């Protein structure tokens, strides 16, 4: 590969795979407390999604700009 995509994507894929299992681990694991902790999880999960979707958008722009560049 001319543009060292192998390492770029390998490191990126490793980040994702590590994140995926770690998230998966949290994900699968006084009433006032309970209601508050969940509200906090919802707050975190929400940010996670935002940061995660931002990353997704970046990887897309990457693809778009690359492909655009290979054709003009």
């Amino acid at each position: 590969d001319v543009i060292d995509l192998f390492n770029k994507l390998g490191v990126f894929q490793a980040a994702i795979l590590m994140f995926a299992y770690m998230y998966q681990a949290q994900s699968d694991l006084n009433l006032t407390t309970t209601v508050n902790n969940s509200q906090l999880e919802i707050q975190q999960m929400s940010n996670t999604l935002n940061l995660l979707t931002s990353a997704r958008s970046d990887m897309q722009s990457l693809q778009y700009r690359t492909i655009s560049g290979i054709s003009l």
């Binding site: 590969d1 001319v2 543009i3 060292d4 995509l5 770029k8 994507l9 490191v11 990126f12 894929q13 980040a15 994702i16 590590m18 994140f19 995926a20 770690m22 998230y23 949290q26 994900s27 209601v35 969940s38 509200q39 999880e41 919802i42 975190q44 999960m45 929400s46 996670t48 999604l49 940061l51 995660l52 979707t53 931002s54 990353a55 997704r56 970046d58 990887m59 897309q60 722009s61 990457l62 693809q63 700009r65 690359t66 492909i67 560049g69 290979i70 003009l72």
Partner: protein, 84 residues
């Protein structure tokens, strides 16, 4: 209420799982990008229009826009792992 909270956690979780699969897919589609980029090389052998494109791409992925987009996404994922 407990029920609303559960519904919201399920939504988020599903949303997040989709973002993971989407990314995993985007990463896979990058092999097409790999193949394309190598084809651009072959064409660069004889064609200088291709050569100029390739070099622009190379600079882009090393200290240009593509590289920055890339670092951006990667650091966001690292930030996520961080908060875990």
């Amino acid at each position: 209420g407990i029920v609303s909270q559960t519904r919201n956690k399920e939504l988020l979780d599903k949303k997040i799982r989709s973002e993971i699969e989407a990314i995993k897919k985007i990463i896979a589609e990058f092999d097409v990008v790999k193949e394309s980029v190598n084809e651009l090389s072959e064409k660069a052998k004889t064609d200088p229009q291709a050569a100029e494109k390739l070099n622009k791409l190379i600079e882009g992925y090393t200290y240009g826009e593509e590289r920055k987009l890339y670092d951006s996404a990667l650091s966001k994922i690292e930030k996520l792992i961080e908060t875990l």
